[PDB]
Amino acid sequence: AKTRSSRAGLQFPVGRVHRLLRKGNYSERVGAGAPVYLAAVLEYLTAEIL
DNA sequence: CGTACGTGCGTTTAAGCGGTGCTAGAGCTGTCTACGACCAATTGAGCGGCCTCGGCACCGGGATTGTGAAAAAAAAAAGCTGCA
Ligand SMILES: [Ca+2]
């Protein structure tokens, strides 16, 4: 087993983000690509501030 | 005190109206399946707890920056003399 973060080449937790989406009342369903996309965006922004 | 705006003329222009004519593309129905919820077993990433140790908070003291008053350099602006 290796994390979805490592598959996507990311530091931010794709698995955590996907759960937050499922548990945050945004939609009924969540695509696999979504949390990957999002995590990456939050990491980019984070990197740009740091 | 100067002229940029508001006013009220005429002159020009194209917005709006009503109508026709085409067709892109919105928007629908039905069929199919790939893609996500769901579950359960698995099990590592991430948590709380805790201990070091080096960066930052603080201090004192000297170096530098910056303000401001009053005293020079200079510029300037009037009164005085002669003046072709
Ligand atoms: Ca910790």
mmCIF file of all heavy atoms in Angstrom, chain B residues 62-74:
data_model
loop_
_atom_site.group_PDB
_atom_site.id
_atom_site.type_symbol
_atom_site.label_atom_id
_atom_site.label_comp_id
_atom_site.label_asym_id
_atom_site.label_seq_id
_atom_site.Cartn_x
_atom_site.Cartn_y
_atom_site.Cartn_z
ATOM 1 P P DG B 62 29.914 52.616 26.030
ATOM 2 O OP1 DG B 62 31.204 52.302 26.699
ATOM 3 O OP2 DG B 62 29.015 53.652 26.605
ATOM 4 O "O5'" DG B 62 30.222 52.998 24.516
ATOM 5 C "C5'" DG B 62 30.789 52.027 23.621
ATOM 6 C "C4'" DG B 62 30.080 52.063 22.287
ATOM 7 O "O4'" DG B 62 28.642 51.957 22.438
ATOM 8 C "C3'" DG B 62 30.324 53.337 21.472
ATOM 9 O "O3'" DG B 62 31.050 52.978 20.292
ATOM 10 C "C2'" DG B 62 28.926 53.858 21.172
ATOM 11 C "C1'" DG B 62 28.087 52.612 21.318
ATOM 12 N N9 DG B 62 26.665 52.839 21.566
ATOM 13 C C8 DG B 62 26.086 53.326 22.713
ATOM 14 N N7 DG B 62 24.788 53.432 22.627
ATOM 15 C C5 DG B 62 24.493 53.004 21.341
ATOM 16 C C6 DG B 62 23.246 52.901 20.671
ATOM 17 O O6 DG B 62 22.119 53.177 21.096
ATOM 18 N N1 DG B 62 23.402 52.421 19.374
ATOM 19 C C2 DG B 62 24.601 52.080 18.796
ATOM 20 N N2 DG B 62 24.545 51.637 17.533
ATOM 21 N N3 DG B 62 25.770 52.176 19.409
ATOM 22 C C4 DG B 62 25.641 52.638 20.670
ATOM 23 P P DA B 63 31.414 54.080 19.201
ATOM 24 O OP1 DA B 63 32.732 53.726 18.616
ATOM 25 O OP2 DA B 63 31.196 55.428 19.802
ATOM 26 O "O5'" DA B 63 30.301 53.854 18.086
ATOM 27 C "C5'" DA B 63 30.350 52.742 17.177
ATOM 28 C "C4'" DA B 63 29.352 52.970 16.067
ATOM 29 O "O4'" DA B 63 28.033 53.125 16.646
ATOM 30 C "C3'" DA B 63 29.609 54.238 15.250
ATOM 31 O "O3'" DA B 63 29.440 53.966 13.855
ATOM 32 C "C2'" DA B 63 28.617 55.234 15.824
ATOM 33 C "C1'" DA B 63 27.452 54.342 16.204
ATOM 34 N N9 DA B 63 26.601 54.856 17.279
ATOM 35 C C8 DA B 63 26.995 55.325 18.506
ATOM 36 N N7 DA B 63 26.002 55.724 19.263
ATOM 37 C C5 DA B 63 24.877 55.505 18.480
ATOM 38 C C6 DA B 63 23.507 55.718 18.712
ATOM 39 N N6 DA B 63 23.018 56.219 19.847
ATOM 40 N N1 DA B 63 22.644 55.395 17.722
ATOM 41 C C2 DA B 63 23.135 54.889 16.583
ATOM 42 N N3 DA B 63 24.401 54.639 16.249
ATOM 43 C C4 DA B 63 25.232 54.973 17.254
ATOM 44 P P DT B 64 29.485 55.158 12.779
ATOM 45 O OP1 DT B 64 30.003 54.606 11.500
ATOM 46 O OP2 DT B 64 30.140 56.341 13.407
ATOM 47 O "O5'" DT B 64 27.940 55.463 12.540
ATOM 48 C "C5'" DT B 64 27.028 54.343 12.396
ATOM 49 C "C4'" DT B 64 25.633 54.844 12.103
ATOM 50 O "O4'" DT B 64 25.024 55.335 13.324
ATOM 51 C "C3'" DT B 64 25.553 55.989 11.088
ATOM 52 O "O3'" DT B 64 24.551 55.640 10.121
ATOM 53 C "C2'" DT B 64 25.267 57.205 11.954
ATOM 54 C "C1'" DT B 64 24.440 56.600 13.076
ATOM 55 N N1 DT B 64 24.427 57.356 14.347
ATOM 56 C C2 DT B 64 23.231 57.872 14.804
ATOM 57 O O2 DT B 64 22.174 57.744 14.207
ATOM 58 N N3 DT B 64 23.320 58.548 15.995
ATOM 59 C C4 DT B 64 24.456 58.751 16.758
ATOM 60 O O4 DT B 64 24.380 59.374 17.811
ATOM 61 C C5 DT B 64 25.670 58.178 16.225
ATOM 62 C C7 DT B 64 26.948 58.352 16.983
ATOM 63 C C6 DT B 64 25.597 57.522 15.060
ATOM 64 P P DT B 65 24.229 56.587 8.857
ATOM 65 O OP1 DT B 65 23.970 55.712 7.679
ATOM 66 O OP2 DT B 65 25.277 57.642 8.775
ATOM 67 O "O5'" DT B 65 22.850 57.269 9.271
ATOM 68 C "C5'" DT B 65 22.207 56.948 10.520
ATOM 69 C "C4'" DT B 65 20.756 57.354 10.513
ATOM 70 O "O4'" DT B 65 20.485 58.032 11.757
ATOM 71 C "C3'" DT B 65 20.390 58.370 9.441
ATOM 72 O "O3'" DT B 65 18.974 58.326 9.275
ATOM 73 C "C2'" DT B 65 20.862 59.661 10.076
ATOM 74 C "C1'" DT B 65 20.420 59.438 11.521
ATOM 75 N N1 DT B 65 21.203 60.119 12.581
ATOM 76 C C2 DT B 65 20.536 60.464 13.736
ATOM 77 O O2 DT B 65 19.348 60.245 13.912
ATOM 78 N N3 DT B 65 21.313 61.085 14.680
ATOM 79 C C4 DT B 65 22.657 61.389 14.587
ATOM 80 O O4 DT B 65 23.221 61.953 15.519
ATOM 81 C C5 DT B 65 23.295 60.999 13.352
ATOM 82 C C7 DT B 65 24.751 61.287 13.161
ATOM 83 C C6 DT B 65 22.547 60.386 12.425
ATOM 84 P P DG B 66 18.254 59.366 8.323
ATOM 85 O OP1 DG B 66 17.074 58.692 7.728
ATOM 86 O OP2 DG B 66 19.281 59.996 7.441
ATOM 87 O "O5'" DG B 66 17.745 60.467 9.351
ATOM 88 C "C5'" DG B 66 16.729 60.173 10.324
ATOM 89 C "C4'" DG B 66 16.318 61.453 11.013
ATOM 90 O "O4'" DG B 66 17.386 61.896 11.887
ATOM 91 C "C3'" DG B 66 16.039 62.630 10.072
ATOM 92 O "O3'" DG B 66 14.958 63.376 10.630
ATOM 93 C "C2'" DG B 66 17.326 63.433 10.129
ATOM 94 C "C1'" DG B 66 17.679 63.256 11.591
ATOM 95 N N9 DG B 66 19.059 63.525 11.987
ATOM 96 C C8 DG B 66 20.217 63.175 11.335
ATOM 97 N N7 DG B 66 21.295 63.564 11.962
ATOM 98 C C5 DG B 66 20.818 64.206 13.097
ATOM 99 C C6 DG B 66 21.515 64.833 14.160
ATOM 100 O O6 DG B 66 22.736 64.951 14.319
ATOM 101 N N1 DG B 66 20.641 65.357 15.107
ATOM 102 C C2 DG B 66 19.270 65.291 15.039
ATOM 103 N N2 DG B 66 18.593 65.857 16.049
ATOM 104 N N3 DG B 66 18.608 64.709 14.054
ATOM 105 C C4 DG B 66 19.439 64.192 13.125
ATOM 106 P P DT B 67 14.081 64.352 9.728
ATOM 107 O OP1 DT B 67 12.902 63.589 9.242
ATOM 108 O OP2 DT B 67 14.977 65.049 8.764
ATOM 109 O "O5'" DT B 67 13.549 65.417 10.785
ATOM 110 C "C5'" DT B 67 13.299 65.066 12.162
ATOM 111 C "C4'" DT B 67 13.773 66.180 13.065
ATOM 112 O "O4'" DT B 67 15.217 66.174 13.149
ATOM 113 C "C3'" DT B 67 13.373 67.584 12.601
ATOM 114 O "O3'" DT B 67 12.452 68.150 13.536
ATOM 115 C "C2'" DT B 67 14.688 68.346 12.507
ATOM 116 C "C1'" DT B 67 15.646 67.509 13.336
ATOM 117 N N1 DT B 67 17.079 67.597 12.947
ATOM 118 C C2 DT B 67 17.972 68.165 13.831
ATOM 119 O O2 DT B 67 17.648 68.599 14.927
ATOM 120 N N3 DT B 67 19.272 68.203 13.386
ATOM 121 C C4 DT B 67 19.753 67.750 12.172
ATOM 122 O O4 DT B 67 20.948 67.854 11.911
ATOM 123 C C5 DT B 67 18.762 67.170 11.294
ATOM 124 C C7 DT B 67 19.191 66.648 9.958
ATOM 125 C C6 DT B 67 17.492 67.125 11.719
ATOM 126 P P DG B 68 11.701 69.517 13.198
ATOM 127 O OP1 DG B 68 10.297 69.413 13.667
ATOM 128 O OP2 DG B 68 11.995 69.887 11.792
ATOM 129 O "O5'" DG B 68 12.426 70.572 14.139
ATOM 130 C "C5'" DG B 68 13.186 70.198 15.304
ATOM 131 C "C4'" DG B 68 14.078 71.350 15.700
ATOM 132 O "O4'" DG B 68 15.443 71.058 15.303
ATOM 133 C "C3'" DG B 68 13.722 72.676 15.014
ATOM 134 O "O3'" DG B 68 13.987 73.766 15.890
ATOM 135 C "C2'" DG B 68 14.677 72.703 13.840
ATOM 136 C "C1'" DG B 68 15.908 72.140 14.513
ATOM 137 N N9 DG B 68 16.949 71.658 13.615
ATOM 138 C C8 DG B 68 16.800 71.093 12.370
ATOM 139 N N7 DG B 68 17.940 70.825 11.791
ATOM 140 C C5 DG B 68 18.895 71.267 12.695
ATOM 141 C C6 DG B 68 20.310 71.237 12.623
ATOM 142 O O6 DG B 68 21.027 70.804 11.712
ATOM 143 N N1 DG B 68 20.891 71.791 13.761
ATOM 144 C C2 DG B 68 20.200 72.301 14.835
ATOM 145 N N2 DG B 68 20.938 72.790 15.842
ATOM 146 N N3 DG B 68 18.881 72.324 14.917
ATOM 147 C C4 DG B 68 18.298 71.795 13.821
ATOM 148 P P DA B 69 13.354 75.208 15.621
ATOM 149 O OP1 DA B 69 12.007 75.239 16.244
ATOM 150 O OP2 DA B 69 13.505 75.539 14.180
ATOM 151 O "O5'" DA B 69 14.315 76.151 16.469
ATOM 152 C "C5'" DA B 69 14.953 75.686 17.682
ATOM 153 C "C4'" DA B 69 16.310 76.333 17.821
ATOM 154 O "O4'" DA B 69 17.242 75.689 16.919
ATOM 155 C "C3'" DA B 69 16.315 77.824 17.470
ATOM 156 O "O3'" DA B 69 16.940 78.625 18.483
ATOM 157 C "C2'" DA B 69 16.991 77.880 16.111
ATOM 158 C "C1'" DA B 69 17.883 76.650 16.099
ATOM 159 N N9 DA B 69 18.052 76.062 14.771
ATOM 160 C C8 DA B 69 17.062 75.780 13.861
ATOM 161 N N7 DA B 69 17.505 75.267 12.739
ATOM 162 C C5 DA B 69 18.880 75.205 12.921
ATOM 163 C C6 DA B 69 19.924 74.748 12.096
ATOM 164 N N6 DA B 69 19.734 74.251 10.872
ATOM 165 N N1 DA B 69 21.187 74.831 12.574
ATOM 166 C C2 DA B 69 21.377 75.332 13.803
ATOM 167 N N3 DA B 69 20.475 75.789 14.674
ATOM 168 C C4 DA B 69 19.233 75.695 14.167
ATOM 169 P P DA B 70 16.941 80.230 18.358
ATOM 170 O OP1 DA B 70 16.788 80.793 19.724
ATOM 171 O OP2 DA B 70 15.978 80.626 17.291
ATOM 172 O "O5'" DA B 70 18.417 80.536 17.844
ATOM 173 C "C5'" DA B 70 19.552 79.787 18.322
ATOM 174 C "C4'" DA B 70 20.753 80.068 17.452
ATOM 175 O "O4'" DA B 70 20.648 79.323 16.213
ATOM 176 C "C3'" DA B 70 20.923 81.531 17.036
ATOM 177 O "O3'" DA B 70 22.329 81.753 16.910
ATOM 178 C "C2'" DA B 70 20.292 81.562 15.657
ATOM 179 C "C1'" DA B 70 20.795 80.231 15.128
ATOM 180 N N9 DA B 70 20.107 79.673 13.963
ATOM 181 C C8 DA B 70 18.785 79.772 13.605
ATOM 182 N N7 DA B 70 18.493 79.153 12.486
ATOM 183 C C5 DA B 70 19.706 78.614 12.078
ATOM 184 C C6 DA B 70 20.071 77.842 10.960
ATOM 185 N N6 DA B 70 19.212 77.460 10.012
ATOM 186 N N1 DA B 70 21.366 77.466 10.851
ATOM 187 C C2 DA B 70 22.228 77.848 11.803
ATOM 188 N N3 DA B 70 22.005 78.572 12.899
ATOM 189 C C4 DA B 70 20.710 78.928 12.977
ATOM 190 P P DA B 71 23.002 83.127 17.354
ATOM 191 O OP1 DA B 71 23.389 83.006 18.786
ATOM 192 O OP2 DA B 71 22.106 84.236 16.929
ATOM 193 O "O5'" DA B 71 24.329 83.127 16.468
ATOM 194 C "C5'" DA B 71 25.153 81.940 16.360
ATOM 195 C "C4'" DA B 71 25.460 81.604 14.918
ATOM 196 O "O4'" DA B 71 24.273 81.242 14.170
ATOM 197 C "C3'" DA B 71 26.139 82.719 14.114
ATOM 198 O "O3'" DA B 71 27.399 82.210 13.660
ATOM 199 C "C2'" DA B 71 25.162 83.005 12.981
ATOM 200 C "C1'" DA B 71 24.474 81.669 12.836
ATOM 201 N N9 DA B 71 23.177 81.688 12.157
ATOM 202 C C8 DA B 71 22.010 82.281 12.577
ATOM 203 N N7 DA B 71 21.005 82.111 11.752
ATOM 204 C C5 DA B 71 21.545 81.359 10.717
ATOM 205 C C6 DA B 71 20.991 80.843 9.528
ATOM 206 N N6 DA B 71 19.718 81.022 9.165
ATOM 207 N N1 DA B 71 21.806 80.136 8.711
ATOM 208 C C2 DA B 71 23.085 79.959 9.074
ATOM 209 N N3 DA B 71 23.718 80.389 10.166
ATOM 210 C C4 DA B 71 22.883 81.092 10.954
ATOM 211 P P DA B 72 28.459 83.165 12.937
ATOM 212 O OP1 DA B 72 29.810 82.565 13.096
ATOM 213 O OP2 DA B 72 28.208 84.560 13.381
ATOM 214 O "O5'" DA B 72 28.059 83.033 11.403
ATOM 215 C "C5'" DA B 72 28.933 83.499 10.365
ATOM 216 C "C4'" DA B 72 29.026 82.459 9.275
ATOM 217 O "O4'" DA B 72 27.731 81.838 9.090
ATOM 218 C "C3'" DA B 72 29.414 83.020 7.912
ATOM 219 O "O3'" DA B 72 30.198 82.069 7.177
ATOM 220 C "C2'" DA B 72 28.072 83.305 7.266
ATOM 221 C "C1'" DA B 72 27.139 82.262 7.867
ATOM 222 N N9 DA B 72 25.792 82.753 8.162
ATOM 223 C C8 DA B 72 25.384 83.503 9.237
ATOM 224 N N7 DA B 72 24.106 83.791 9.227
ATOM 225 C C5 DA B 72 23.638 83.192 8.065
ATOM 226 C C6 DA B 72 22.362 83.131 7.478
ATOM 227 N N6 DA B 72 21.275 83.702 8.005
ATOM 228 N N1 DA B 72 22.236 82.447 6.320
ATOM 229 C C2 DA B 72 23.328 81.875 5.791
ATOM 230 N N3 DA B 72 24.577 81.864 6.247
ATOM 231 C C4 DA B 72 24.667 82.548 7.400
ATOM 232 P P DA B 73 30.971 82.504 5.832
ATOM 233 O OP1 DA B 73 32.121 81.578 5.649
ATOM 234 O OP2 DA B 73 31.214 83.969 5.880
ATOM 235 O "O5'" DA B 73 29.887 82.246 4.690
ATOM 236 C "C5'" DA B 73 29.916 81.057 3.883
ATOM 237 C "C4'" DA B 73 28.943 81.187 2.734
ATOM 238 O "O4'" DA B 73 27.652 81.652 3.211
ATOM 239 C "C3'" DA B 73 29.357 82.178 1.645
ATOM 240 O "O3'" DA B 73 28.974 81.561 0.409
ATOM 241 C "C2'" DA B 73 28.589 83.427 2.037
ATOM 242 C "C1'" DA B 73 27.276 82.811 2.479
ATOM 243 N N9 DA B 73 26.463 83.654 3.353
ATOM 244 C C8 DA B 73 26.915 84.395 4.416
ATOM 245 N N7 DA B 73 25.972 85.058 5.037
ATOM 246 C C5 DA B 73 24.821 84.745 4.329
ATOM 247 C C6 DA B 73 23.480 85.135 4.486
ATOM 248 N N6 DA B 73 23.058 85.966 5.442
ATOM 249 N N1 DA B 73 22.576 84.642 3.609
ATOM 250 C C2 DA B 73 23.002 83.811 2.647
ATOM 251 N N3 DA B 73 24.235 83.372 2.399
ATOM 252 C C4 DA B 73 25.108 83.881 3.287
ATOM 253 P P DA B 74 28.940 82.378 -0.969
ATOM 254 O OP1 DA B 74 30.288 82.277 -1.596
ATOM 255 O OP2 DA B 74 28.337 83.714 -0.727
ATOM 256 O "O5'" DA B 74 27.889 81.550 -1.839
ATOM 257 C "C5'" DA B 74 26.531 81.342 -1.388
ATOM 258 C "C4'" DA B 74 25.611 82.449 -1.853
ATOM 259 O "O4'" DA B 74 25.228 83.279 -0.735
ATOM 260 C "C3'" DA B 74 26.168 83.409 -2.914
ATOM 261 O "O3'" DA B 74 25.807 82.970 -4.240
ATOM 262 C "C2'" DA B 74 25.801 84.801 -2.406
ATOM 263 C "C1'" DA B 74 24.843 84.535 -1.252
ATOM 264 N N9 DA B 74 24.859 85.498 -0.149
ATOM 265 C C8 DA B 74 25.940 86.035 0.507
ATOM 266 N N7 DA B 74 25.614 86.859 1.473
ATOM 267 C C5 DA B 74 24.227 86.857 1.461
ATOM 268 C C6 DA B 74 23.270 87.530 2.244
ATOM 269 N N6 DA B 74 23.582 88.368 3.234
ATOM 270 N N1 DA B 74 21.966 87.301 1.975
ATOM 271 C C2 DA B 74 21.654 86.455 0.984
ATOM 272 N N3 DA B 74 22.460 85.772 0.174
ATOM 273 C C4 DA B 74 23.748 86.021 0.467
#
